Design a protein around this ligand. Sequence first.
Ligand SMILES: [Cu+2]
Ligand SMILES: [Cu+2]
Length: 128
Amino acid sequence: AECSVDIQGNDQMQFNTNAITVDKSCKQFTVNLSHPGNLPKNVMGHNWVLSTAADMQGVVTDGMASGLDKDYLKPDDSRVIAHTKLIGSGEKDSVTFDVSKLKEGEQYMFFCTFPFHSALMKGTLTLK
Ligand SMILES: [Cu+2]
Ligand SMILES: [Cu+2]
């Protein structure tokens, strides 16, 4: 089975997908994030941040208050399972995390923590 996925966020606060599936036989999983847009990082920045469905609101709120200098993530936030860096127009970044960090039956969300982007840019990640 495949153990990677390519996601894109555009100049319209859309994610290329809203549902990620991780196969149970994968030992590592990789997200390749891309920005095929024109607005820069300080205007239309996007990251890919993974957490449980319960920790989402806390990560986004504390992320907003963290500022652009911290890629809109509160430092030493234990709720972030895995994440990419905040990117701007024509930029790319990938993250690889251990599938052992995921539990079957638990429900996870991936989102962008750029202020107010999480309302449009959200999605589910399930371990299958
Ligand atoms: Cu964003
Ligand atoms: Cu980190």
